[PDB]
Ligand binder design. Structure first.
Ligand code: HDD
Ligand code: HDD
Ligand code: HDD
Ligand SMILES: [Ca+2]
Ligand SMILES: [Ca+2]
Ligand SMILES: [Ca+2]
Ligand SMILES: [Ca+2]
Ligand SMILES: [Ca+2]
Ligand SMILES: [Ca+2]
Lengths: 671, 318, 673
């Protein structure tokens, strides 16, 4: 692997310059002990020049993100549907690198911003790198790539003051959404729990666009990629996400790092929906339109293989920051479609790496290199790392015997465009009328959510739209929301003191679709990695004993246990001062600690009780092991996801069911 | 003051960068459901610009915000310095100031616990003069060659890039405990000075001893201190943590709003002035940036008024 | 190759993208067979994006040049004078890369411009890369690095029109030389045959500055580097250089390439002059002044080892274009001096690689990498190729157990500044008065040239100064020249229609120094690689037979033989149409071809012109076969002339002709004032 060959070990040895001369780097060379620094101090200048040039431009979008290595394993020989080599045998393994991300925030912004999320996967295949550059939401805001700067300018901070960071909760974003109705579908997804996933491991990945699978015989079918999480679907609640943004901006990257280090590497079934070319317009919308899903009722999923992430990077900058994905990284057996969003992306990702890398040889960085030989006549450019032996790099040649040879459908396993593809008509800058229904699918999505999930979505819209200053923009927003659902418009309008426009039923319907609801997706299939905070005290030996008993049990079940007390000592992981309910998926108070919940210079006033109360409010399983604590927290003892047992084994059993349930949604008020 | 470079787009038809009227909402395609054409120059110029919008963030002080204003001299300071911007009572010079944290990237929170930058440009009639200062008067290290060591240790661990905008991790405290020069700045950063209430409620310091040089060639040693007219104020830590989540833009918004409401912040630009002969007279070396001159030993002299009163037009450009 | 690990072979296989996907690259993807090209054609865009970005900025100076790989071998353990590891044992070998260059011309300018030449050597030592970034002239134009942009702006093309290319023959250059008298010494060198060397192999290399050798015990001595050519010293004559610039702009790079391919890799003795620190001002000038040489009469050369170039690059761009030299690439055992020209260079070469490479990781390019491990806390930056395992890259640390460890005089073989070095005094932007004699050494140099060599130098000045349009600049030039030599000023003034100023004898003297004259350096020590053109005809089978016999006899001795005739056929290398006297070091006509001395196959009079040009330019010329009068008379070449040969016997002809090739130039053919 190119990555192994380029690893540099500094566990031993004397300091050297970049050209191998042993040096020092701690004191400048001066004319006298209290004198000025000398220009001839090359040790100083090489070190400081490197430092001065460490930074590269952040990605234009998805600047905030984190990555990991893993493997993809095929379930079968898929030759019957695609020529793709990485899919050509049962058990065939291909290395992968995945980067997850938000979209709008800059590289130091919070993981738990409300946003669309990226899910970009590189398959280092035996016939070239293949990238699926996806998102955690299956539909996109816009229908033509030329509009991308308009969307992104509108959601990013206002350009006079660069406010607000990593948020759509401002006038410009809602101005764009209300003027560009294509945005409605993705907007509803982003305003649902999909905008604030519990982790990268608890979200799905989607290619968004229709692509083609192409067989060696030249025939093609239309596909959608869906990476289905084996960890389950889970979200934060909004208030929890806001607190998290402050308490731990690195929450998702830490969660991923930790899951991998503990041997709990996340998995996805890599799936496709597969339909015939003749079905491009058969489902009541156009498969070229990236604002539309194919409901699973119309086309089921085929599981192709397993994606597992199981190794963290060695150097974040070299691997995660420098990975340069492209939908143009395609392999024989896959083709594009005429989706005008996809079409323009192909241009952007090749171009933008020039900005990031500062030169044209970015595919030579170890993380971007393939795992097969490269034979082409690309030459020179800044940062050229190869020494090419072929002195006749032109085609056609005789002086290099005609090498490299052209690869195509009938030679060298070449990529080829699906041969059934055609174009016909005027050369036009016109939108297909088949793209015109911007509201029915947002309504389908909304209908498919549970009542509390609908409330959360309404509440996300109430929150953001109430921060829009322009009365005109707010009225225009209600106009668009009303075209999706009158009830949504009414409920949002109520928070902002405006009147909703009269019902417009053109696009209203009562249809639902499977697989889009988080709340309705049932209990989590595993609770491994979930976090339990045990709130204890150093003042009672019994409290620490209770905590240790709980820890032993919970840890064998794969839970990450944090014992919290006033001060650190053996068995205590965290002080009350640094602890917060956002750090846990479940909270347990050991009954010996009751007095803390009734002042200390060691933590802020009321901190122990606030952790328990916040956890309860945010829907988490909470309990007391060993009435007074529940009374102080105003937590009803008979509440769903509230536990009270003297028996540790009984408590652990019940609490673990609570962790799988994950959120107790009956704690949230409904319109 | 940058009016000559402003571009107005409150009217008119869309053009390319070379003035040709164009559109930018639909790609050119071979048929209404067809593939996009390479000859679509409207598409490519717009997307190429977007693709190249970003530039590297600053290596340190990446997170920050700025404003325009004016400096006004209180006197003719010719008797201590030849500096033209200080050569007459009431003399005005335009300024631009940027405030910042140190460790966090772009988009990190304003209310992280950190040292803060306070960088001032005076656009003087004899050249631009910059005082690139911090809100804490002493620095962590005693030799510039150690800067990458300090900064690597406080910035996120380089395998996972965790944690953002924080000294609360092993590497930073490893460095602090192995490099004892860091103790003074550390104590400042752990005080309320690490979490100021606003940019307007902190002071600015040049940190280093500089020289004032008269036209006759004589010199004196100086320290710069910009003393806030708004007062000194801090957040409490638990409040700062919540603010980092509820409003990452808190300090930049506070500054923007104070200027828009006609409450532009002010500082007295001051110096401590001492003789060359006093370089080692105070029980420490004035060449050592980890030391302050206590005010009991050398009082502040007020040179003039710094007022920030105009927000930028384009954040990126300015 | 030393860089074998980075080589990419394309002698087999199918075309791929840069990420290994097999593709084609000959036809664009179109909407229909006569349709528009598609944006989704990634094959097209990746190929054309690479092409669009192939170029990098040329070097700010020395843009035109060529390089080769080789080996340095030490002649002894030099620990008595230096701690340097590459010099620490008899027979110790270190790989090298050398680049030679002109100074002023851009890429693609002619090799045979009149100029100073670069001679830059990298030693990939077992204690780090060590570069000696030298020139073929031992003194520099200016005494302070801050003046470099002034010098270079003045010699490079005028910035309104970018004229003239690769030439000092214009007003601005001579304005600068006349206003900045420090320039006189290098100017005299550049106007000598040293400005137009016969090849890179026939010039010497100089470090120019005084450096220090530092022993492990901390003691230091002052040194000058001198790489002495084992091929001999040789120059072109100016007219020949001008024709060559047009007929073969690649002359020097071709000569080097070919010498290496034929197993005649060029060699130099790497030498130093060594003197004590106490001698910094003992020789009548300041050793910190880069406009002065130490005459060999005062300090002899010590031979340290052998430098041999014996392997050409595989990819010119990757190796020769991307090599990034720095005098900051120094190793334990060597140190700087307070020469203000050297001092500023240290800054420039680190900074300029950011422009060339576009990013800070230029030491990672294969040609710039060291041959030993790198242990440091440098990180990130565009184009970062390493994956660093150490996640605590700060000092002092405990979390990486205090590694990397600091290296210094007493631990880890660290570089250390010579510990006897001191500074004292005011912080000043003032020139030392010890630097003020700008004229005595130019006169020493001029005095050391032979009479015809002095004439060539005067003639170079007459040529260039006659092209200066400003009469004030011309007068100012004569004022400066006159301070070196009244006779030079008078002889130059004569060509430009001005009067020389009255003699000013302040700096005049009659002293001479050894080893700076080309004309006086004696016959070449080897004639291997020298070029012999044999002018023949296809009209006479006998002429081709003569040429074949001569070829065999000359090739036996390592000469490169070209047989020229009207048209190509077996045994004939070049047509008269492509042939020129500048392609040869000696020219022989076979007597069977005497009739040639009009056709649609070459320009009128071309065969005779080759012979006449060769004679005029001082080369050995001759007629082989016994009948010489017809050819020699047509050429107006005297049959008894030195370096003119005529013999029936091929053996006897070649024996005489080879002596002429070693003499190299017959200077009796040039008129003197
Ligand atoms: C026409 C421009 C354009 C359009 C319409 C899109 N993008 Fe994009 N995308 C870019 C232009 C771009 C970019 C500017 O080229 C980025 C920035 C960094 C990079 O490599 O490409 C990028 C980055 C980027 C990343 C981050 C990859 C990483 O982790 O390094 C993801 C996951 C996506 N995009 C996903 C999408 C999806 C799912 C889209 C709609 C289906 C989409 N993009 C439309
Ligand atoms: C040797 C390196 C080095 C050292 C020792 C310091 N800095 Fe610095 N500083 C930089 C290298 C640097 C830099 C890498 O050059 C930056 C990044 C962006 C820039 O323009 O310069 C910078 C940025 C920077 C900024 C941001 C200016 C802006 O808003 O754009 C401030 C306020 C400071 N620094 C202040 C200080 C103070 C008060 C220091 C100690 C007295 C200090 N720096 C030591
Ligand atoms: C302060 C500026 C400055 C000064 C005073 C000099 N140079 Fe230099 N030199 C450069 C600034 C520079 C440079 C701009 O940094 C170059 C351009 C390309 C490079 O790598 O460095 C360079 C290139 C360069 C090269 C080409 C190296 C190669 O083949 O790539 C040679 C041989 C020299 N120089 C030699 C000299 C000598 C013998 C000097 C006087 C003793 C000298 N330079 C003074
Ligand atoms: Ca806005
Ligand atoms: Ca939810
Ligand atoms: Ca750490
Ligand atoms: Ca305080
Ligand atoms: Ca000129
Ligand atoms: Ca030293």
């Amino acid at each position: 692997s190119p990555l192994a060959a380029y690893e540099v070990d500094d566990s031993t040895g004397y300091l050297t310059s970049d050209v191998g001369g042993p040096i020092q780097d701690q004191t400048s060379l001066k004319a006298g002990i209290r004198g000025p620094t000398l220009l001839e101090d090359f040790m100083f200048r090489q070190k400081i020049q490197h430092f001065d040039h460490e930074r590269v431009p952040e990605r234009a979008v998805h600047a905030r993100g984190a990555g990991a290595h893993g493997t993809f394993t095929s379930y079968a020989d898929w030759s019957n549907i695609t020529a793709a080599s990485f899919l050509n045998a049962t058990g065939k393994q291909t290395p992968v690198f995945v980067r997850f991300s938000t979209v709008a925030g800059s590289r130091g912004s919070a993981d738990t911003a409300r946003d669309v999320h990226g899910f970009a996967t590189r398959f280092y295949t035996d016939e070239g790198n293949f990238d699926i550059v996806g998102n955690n939401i299956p539909v996109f805001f816009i229908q033509d790539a030329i509009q991308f700067p308009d969307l992104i300018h509108s959601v990013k901070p206002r350009p006079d003051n660069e406010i607000p960071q990593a948020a759509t909760a401002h006038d410009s974003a809602w101005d764009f959404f209300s003027q560009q109705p294509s945005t409605m579908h993705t907007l509803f997804w982003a305003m649902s729990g999909h905008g604030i996933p519990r982790s990268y491991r608890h979200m799905d990945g989607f290619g968004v666009h229709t692509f083609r699978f192409v067989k060696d015989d030249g025939s093609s079918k239309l596909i959608k990629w869906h990476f289905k999480s084996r960890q389950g679907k889970a979200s934060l609640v909004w208030e929890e996400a806001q607190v998290l943004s402050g308490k731990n901006a690195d929450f998702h990257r830490q969660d991923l790092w930790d899951a991998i280090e503990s041997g709990n590497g996340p998995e996805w079934d890599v799936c496709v929906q597969i339909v015939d070319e003749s079905q491009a317009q058969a489902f009541g919308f156009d498969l070229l339109d990236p604002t539309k899903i194919i409901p699973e009722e119309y086309a089921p999923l085929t599981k192709l293989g397993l994606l597992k992430l199981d190794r963290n990077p060695t150097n974040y900058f070299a691997e995660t920051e420098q990975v340069m994905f492209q939908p143009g990284h395609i392999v024989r057996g896959i083709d594009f479609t005429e989706d005008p969003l996809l079409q323009g992306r192909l241009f952007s990702y090749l171009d933008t790496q020039l900005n990031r890398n500062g030169g044209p040889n970015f595919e030579q960085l170890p993380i971007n290199m393939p795992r097969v030989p490269i034979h082409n006549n690309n030459r020179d450019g800044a940062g050229q790392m190869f020494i090419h032996r072929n002195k006749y790099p032109y085609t056609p040649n005789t002086l290099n015997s005609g090498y490299p040879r052209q690869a195509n459908q009938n030679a060298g396993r070449g990529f080829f465009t699906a041969p059934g593809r055609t174009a016909s008509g005027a050369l036009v800058r016109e939108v297909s009328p088949t793209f015109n229904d911007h509201w029915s699918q947002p309504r389908l999505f909304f209908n498919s959510l549970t009542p509390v999930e609908q409330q959360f979505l309404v509440n996300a819209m109430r929150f953001e739209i109430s921060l829009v200053k322009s009365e005109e923009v707010k009225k225009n927003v209600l106009t668009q929301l009303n075209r999706v659902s009158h009830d949504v418009a009414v409920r949002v309008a109520a928070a902002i003191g405006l009147g909703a426009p009269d019902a417009d039923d053109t696009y209203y319907h009562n249809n639902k679709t499977a697989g889009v609801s988080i709340v309705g997706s049932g209990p989590l299939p595993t609770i491994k990695t979930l976090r339990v905070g045990i709130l204890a005290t150093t003042s009672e030996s019994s409290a620490l004993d209770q905590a240790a008993q709980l820890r032993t049990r919970l840890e064998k079940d794969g839970l990450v246990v944090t014992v919290v007390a006033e001060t650190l000592r053996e068995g205590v992981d965290q002080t009350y001062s640094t602890a917060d309910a956002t750090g846990f998926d479940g909270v347990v108070v050991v009954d010996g600690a009751a007095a803390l919940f009734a002042s200390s210079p060691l933590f802020p006033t009321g901190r122990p009780l606030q952790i328990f109360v916040d956890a309860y409010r945010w829907g988490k399983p909470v309990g007391v092991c060993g009435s007074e604590v529940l009374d102080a927290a105003d937590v009803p003892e008979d509440g769903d996801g509230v536990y009270s047992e003297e028996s540790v084994d009984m408590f652990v059993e019940e609490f673990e069911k609570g962790l799988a349930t994950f959120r107790f949604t009956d704690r949230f008020a409904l319109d």
